[PDB]
Write a protein that binds this ligand. Sequence first.
Ligand code: CLA
Ligand code: CLA
Ligand code: CLA
Ligand code: CLA
Ligand code: CLA
Ligand code: CLA
Ligand SMILES: CC1=C(/C=C/C(C)=C/C=C/C(C)=C/C=C/C=C(C)/C=C/C=C(C)/C=C/C2=C(C)CCCC2(C)C)C(C)(C)CCC1
Ligand code: SF4
Ligand code: SF4
Ligand code: SF4
Lengths: 74, 80, 73, 743, 157, 42, 74, 143
Amino acid sequence: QAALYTHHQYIAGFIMTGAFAHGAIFFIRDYNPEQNADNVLARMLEHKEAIISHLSWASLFLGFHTLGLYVHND
Amino acid sequence: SHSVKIYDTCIGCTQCVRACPTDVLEMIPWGGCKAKQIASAPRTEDCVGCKRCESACPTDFLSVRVYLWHETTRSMGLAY
Amino acid sequence: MFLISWRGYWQELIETLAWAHERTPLANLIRWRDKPVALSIVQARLVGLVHFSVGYIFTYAAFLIASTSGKFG
Amino acid sequence: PEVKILVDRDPIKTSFEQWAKPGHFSRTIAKGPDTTTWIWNLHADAHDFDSHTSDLEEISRKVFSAHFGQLSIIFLWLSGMYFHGARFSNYEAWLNDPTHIRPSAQVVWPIVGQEILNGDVGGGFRGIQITSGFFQIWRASGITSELQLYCTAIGALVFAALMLFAGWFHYHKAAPKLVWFQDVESMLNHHLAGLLGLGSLSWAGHQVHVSLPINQFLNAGVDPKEIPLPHEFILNRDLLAQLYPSFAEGATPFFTLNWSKYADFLTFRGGLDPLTGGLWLTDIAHHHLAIAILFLIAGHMYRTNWGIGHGIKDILEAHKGPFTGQGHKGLYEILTTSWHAQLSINLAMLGSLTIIVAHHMYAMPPYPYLATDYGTQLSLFTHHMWIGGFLIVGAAAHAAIFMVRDYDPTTRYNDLLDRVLRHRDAIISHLNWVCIFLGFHSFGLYIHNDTMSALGRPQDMFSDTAIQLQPVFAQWIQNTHALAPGTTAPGATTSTSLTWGGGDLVSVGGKVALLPIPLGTADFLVHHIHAFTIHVTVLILLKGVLFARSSRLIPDKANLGFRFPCDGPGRGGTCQVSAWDHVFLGLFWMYNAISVVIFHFSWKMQSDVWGSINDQGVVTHITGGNFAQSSITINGWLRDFLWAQASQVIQSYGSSLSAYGLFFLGAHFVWAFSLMFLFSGRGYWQELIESIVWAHNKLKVAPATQPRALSIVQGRAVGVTHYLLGGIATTWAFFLARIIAVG
Amino acid sequence: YQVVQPINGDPFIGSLETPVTSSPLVAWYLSNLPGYRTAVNPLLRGIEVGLAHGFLLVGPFVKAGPLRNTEIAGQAGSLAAGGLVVILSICLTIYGISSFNEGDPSTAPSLTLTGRKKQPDQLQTADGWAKFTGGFFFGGISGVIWAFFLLYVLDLP
Amino acid sequence: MRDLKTYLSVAPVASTLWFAALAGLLIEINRFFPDALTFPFF
Amino acid sequence: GDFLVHHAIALGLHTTTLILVKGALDARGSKLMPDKKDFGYSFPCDGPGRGGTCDISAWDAFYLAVFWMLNTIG
Amino acid sequence: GFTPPELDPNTPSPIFGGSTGGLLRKAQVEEFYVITWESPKEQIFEMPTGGAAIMREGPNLLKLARKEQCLALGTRLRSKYKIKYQFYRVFPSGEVQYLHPKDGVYPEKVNPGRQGVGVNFRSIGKNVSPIEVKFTGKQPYDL
Ligand code: CLA
Ligand code: CLA
Ligand code: CLA
Ligand code: CLA
Ligand code: CLA
Ligand code: CLA
Ligand SMILES: CC1=C(/C=C/C(C)=C/C=C/C(C)=C/C=C/C=C(C)/C=C/C=C(C)/C=C/C2=C(C)CCCC2(C)C)C(C)(C)CCC1
Ligand code: SF4
Ligand code: SF4
Ligand code: SF4
């Protein structure tokens, strides 16, 4: 049970990283800006700094406080 | 060999040529800026791809571009 | 190694090694068909990530299986 | 050519005007920041004087006054140690019962729960146990009362003030001329004869008049308050004469060459005093006397103003041969011109010295009750190893800075340096090969043993019970030392150190001090590991120096500077070609080498040396002599060393040692934290920062000092700094918890 | 008077002349090793090389091998040296197959150190290399057999 | 004098003064109100 | 104890996701490299100019995110 | 109109004791390089490969392994000293190829006989997206 759970969780992780990898490769090789003009996909690029900055905020909040509570308890 | 290109945003300050350590670039006459000269890359077979020219360009964005491409003995800087 | 050391160090080192091989009797009877160079920048990122990951997985697998199966419980 | 005192008056005006102009020293930095990178450069260039100005005299004046600043800080630090010894120490209680009481010189305030760190150290005293060793020094110096420690702290504070004053004075008032600094014969003559000689002689004086007698009363069981004051031995010579009868003569045997009559308190016995477990103080005073004579003689070698003696340039130039050309011709001009050259040689020799000190202090414990205090001994050895290794990597860095900045064959030429540069490829290729051979034939033997032991073939391992690799040479050497006294040193009563001579185990308070250290296949394999690691460190650093100017890959490398990230992705990629990046890479290998060295020390000393002894003389070592059979395998290091001896630091919570548990985990944390910088690159971070900056401009809170990711070089420097701090502090907590609990 | 000089007088060819490199003892000894006998048929030079090396390899395999302490098979551990001769002969063979084509001439230098024209070694030919490989195999197997034939009256059997 | 106040206004010095004050404050608060997982005054 | 580790897991999902999302959305360009789409998914860097540009490619963002995935699944 | 000076062998070479930094087999079977310059005197100069050599008064010839070594040394000769230099590529057939200064004018000084190479007449941001050149051999910057 331990071996199988570990197995599939690591497989799942690698598969996820690959999924995003091919999202990026899509944006470089295949993405046609004019043919996706002003649709949802182009708007992802259009407000990418809000997206990235808020992922940064969530990661910083989680990191500061989870690490902080662990260290306090230690 | 690495590809090297010049773009008409070039202002002809000659700094890419001065920076190049293998003499890939020249200044040729042109009518598009005040300095009346634009860069050129006639010897990219000697281009090693160090991008000192790009470090030297004052244009925003760059007017030299080094597109690292097929490697050769000359592009890998091999003395052997 | 591949993640902390970067290329130029190894490229110069390999140049000294090429000199060494060409100037060593009996051995310079043997010539390489492909010019020895240091691994590419990206190639080193990949090779080092692969060692990091193989060591990661194999370490945790050994500990997982030995610690559980050793007790079986 | 007439050596003399040379200074200039009021070169620099004492003012706060440039205190208020950050980066005043640099013409670029003084313009202030347009980006955050400015803030880092201000700190990276602050002490790079020869980058601020090209005038050798100004640079020399800055260097000189800076040394005064350093000495001021050192005296303030010593003032701290003596003051804490007087005011916050149990040093008197320990002075009564040294084999039981634990030395403690720091007490914490009861604020947030931290008072648990004030543990039971004995003598009715709660505090932090100290591993520096000051109690054994103070006892060896005859110091008894806290009052004497107070007086020493006050004197130290005064000297801090004097050194600081002299720094300000010789930078702002009387600043020596460049010719004054370059008077090398005068400087060497005064440091050999004046500093080292008169220092050693003065210390011999204190020891024969204070240390020896007061330690006689301490060793005789007298209560320290009842011991005569140190000056009462100077006044009434009957006290000394009762202790040491020779003092009845009145130094007449000294002038009449009857010096043998002083064999009373000046001795060549050697070995250890079995009561204190430290070296004989008679031998030590005699030692400082001999050293004093040797240096006082050595200080007359160099000619100054009276025609007798040597010019160093003459000596250099005479030394040349058929292999080296005109060699040494030109070195006097280089060594009186380049500060970085001098700093390179001095860092090399001072670090190597620190390592030699580390060995000699454990194998010949110089202070009373030092050998049996295992926490202090482990702490001292480990500490000085680290200092030495760091200093040596520094020597490489400044050899490289010389090569890039001060080397000029058209002006200051040297034949030896030119020839080295002229076969750098041969040198580095051969060092490379030796490193590979040593890797295989030291570490590959460990892998051989792990694989044979896992396969159930311990007879096919490299072991004292299977395939023996005896260090025959070292064994023969320590045998020769064991036989030396009475034969090749008839004046020596006992062996030079108890690690040599068989028998003569020394125990204090039931704990052993020193016994003969065995040597076998385990010690062989480890020693070749040390050879290997040192050779690879030397490879990285020497390669950094010799190819700092140029290489086949980059012919104009010296024009890119000493510290630069790369010359770009071309030529296959040229990251880390700078000599700086070779120092960066060599720091990791100094960490590796020194780490394995101190692990070898702890492991071997706990296994084969330290332990408790029975009333009938049965020695139980802290670990069960398991070095010979467990260290010959990597799994044995993981299991019987790391996993076993880490139990104290992971069990320290709830005790006074819990701070070492916290530092264990925190040092792990900063070490892993360094991997973020070492494995990534500033382009990613600068892009991410672009998004964060967008978020700030959205709320009108973007700063004017534009945020920038660290430079490539700074990324590396941060990385290696946290890697080293994390690893070293981790081993620190591990060691101190382990040896304080089980020692 | 100085001991180190540039290689063959040309100070811009990347090497140096030392007692190690250019010395009458060294030059004679290296010149008298089979690999450096440029006019001899490579097959014979391969015979000599294989004899020497195959003879040498028997020692470490037998004395350090896993059956070393079972003297019944420990002596017969020379089969391992034979197998290493086989593997090395494969490496030689594929080195020549990879390095030299059928009708290509020698790649060895055709000049001497003194500048006179020389005839290049046929070792650096496909046929010459094949002959040197066959000779190294024959001499190597033979040298292993010869070393194994001597088990007697030696301080380290 | 003006230059010295300027130096004392510089980032690291103002930071040590500011955080030293903050540390003394928080220390004294934990001295008069130690432990405390909660805001007990409601 | 489950609360704390669940927030570590949240941290790892958010940071890995941050790296990959920033990599994909900056694959066509950033202010530091506005023409990045012209250089492809994987390239070494853009030289030491403009401040230094190591690990600026999208492939480099994947390479960085794999470390965080191994951490998270760990 | 410019006529490249032919490489004159028998031109003297600088005084130098030899180094491990010099030519290798690459010069025998592939290519090497030659830099010539005129010196007013005998000077000491740093070699791009070894240590220090003595530049000879008059014409100097120096065979190097890479073009970049020729251009580095020449840059220094023009900077530290004030010396005109040329250099060439030399193939194992004996053929020589004059390289620098290509026009007899240094390339940082605009010379009218020069033809544009790799010049794109647009801002760099107007390059097309990769998808528009996909399955064609072209690159968006080749236009
Ligand atoms: C123990 C190892 C370690 C640590 C602690 C971090 C820490 C962090 N990484 Mg990193 N990472 C690591 C390993 C590590 N990484 C490795 C090995 C790689 C592969 C190269 C990466 C690659 C990487 C990438 C690509 C990214 C991160 C990101 C982040 C940040 C995530 C957000 C967060 O958690 O808020 C903060 C969390 C912390 C743990 C900060 C700890 C320090 C606190 C603040 C101490 C407070 C100071 C205290 C008073 C003491 C002062 C000391 C005194 C001398 C001044 C965070 C600072 C992401 C990011 O930037 O998020 C926005 C990001 O994109 N990491
Ligand atoms: C006592 C008053 C005084 C005054 C007003 C000045 C004024 C000046 N000095 Mg001088 N100097 C002094 C004392 C003084 N100095 C002393 C005591 C020394 C002996 C060390 C020197 C030696 C000296 C040198 C060698 C030089 C100057 C220079 C200068 C000028 C540059 C401005 C400056 O120094 O900013 C500097 C501001 C600082 C705050 C410096 C702080 C450095 C301290 C000593 C380090 C403390 C160590 C610290 C405890 C480490 C622990 C850190 C830890 C907490 C992490 C300036 C006009 C420089 C110059 O000529 O400019 C071109 C120059 O090179 N001074
Ligand atoms: C995965 C396949 C594989 C196999 C099947 C073997 C098999 C063997 N190994 Mg090897 N090994 C391997 C992988 C393998 N190894 C790898 C990857 C490594 C690198 C880490 C090693 C490194 C290693 C070492 C260091 C040693 C062995 C040894 C041995 C032998 C130990 C048992 C024994 O004593 O037999 C009998 C012992 C003999 C001496 C009989 C010799 C066998 C004859 C000569 C076979 C003839 C070989 C054949 C003609 C040529 C083979 C090439 C062929 C494809 C053309 C055994 C036959 C030991 C050994 O060979 O002893 C010297 C030993 O020293 N192995
Ligand atoms: C016997 C004379 C003598 C003595 C004892 C010293 C001692 C020392 N010198 Mg100096 N020096 C001398 C003569 C002397 N020097 C001469 C003739 C020259 C060439 C002209 C130099 C030039 C020189 C330079 C360039 C430097 C030193 C430095 C040092 C210190 C090295 C660090 C150390 O060991 O700390 C150990 C500490 C002690 C032993 C404490 C005692 C120090 C006392 C207070 C000084 C006693 C000697 C002093 C010169 C007396 C003059 C004082 C008077 C003019 C008011 C050290 C204290 C370094 C330095 O300046 O550090 C700040 C350094 O940079 N020396
Ligand atoms: C007496 C010995 C000595 C001397 C006088 C010097 C002198 C010098 N060195 Mg050298 N060096 C030394 C030893 C020495 N070094 C050693 C032991 C090493 C091995 C690490 C080096 C390696 C080295 C390198 C690689 C470089 C220098 C450089 C320099 C120059 C710039 C100094 C500077 O402004 O940095 C300013 C000082 C700082 C920014 C302090 C940084 C803070 C450190 C990294 C952290 C310390 C951690 C702390 C102790 C523990 C944690 C506490 C914390 C939590 C508060 C300067 C002339 C630099 C140069 O460019 O040369 C011209 C350079 O690149 N040195
Ligand atoms: C455990 C991690 C690790 C390992 C294994 C190595 C390995 C090595 N390093 Mg590296 N290094 C590391 C970490 C590591 N490094 C890190 C983290 C950094 C960043 C600071 C560096 C930076 C660094 C530098 C700058 C340099 C090295 C050098 C070297 C080489 C030293 C010469 C030697 O010992 O050859 C022998 C090889 C070994 C001891 C490795 C183990 C060999 C095994 C046991 C033999 C097994 C063989 C077997 C038959 C396999 C075949 C099986 C088959 C299936 C293929 C060596 C191969 C130096 C060098 O280039 O060499 C001179 C060099 O200059 N390292
Ligand atoms: C029924 C139910 C429920 C509900 C649920 C829900 C409603 C949910 C869902 C969920 C979700 C909702 C999830 C998700 C996830 C996601 C992910 C994981 C993602 C991803 C993405 C990516 C990877 C991307 C990619 C890309 C890019 C980047 C660009 C290009 C394009 C593309 C797309 C390719 C509950 C629990 C309440 C209860 C029970 C019952
Ligand atoms: S990349 Fe380097 S070699 Fe190529 S053109 Fe630019 S400066 Fe010249
Ligand atoms: S650096 Fe840019 S603007 Fe200047 S000459 Fe080169 S291409 Fe033109
Ligand atoms: S990746 Fe960074 S260090 Fe490496 S060549 Fe590019 S800019 Fe230089």
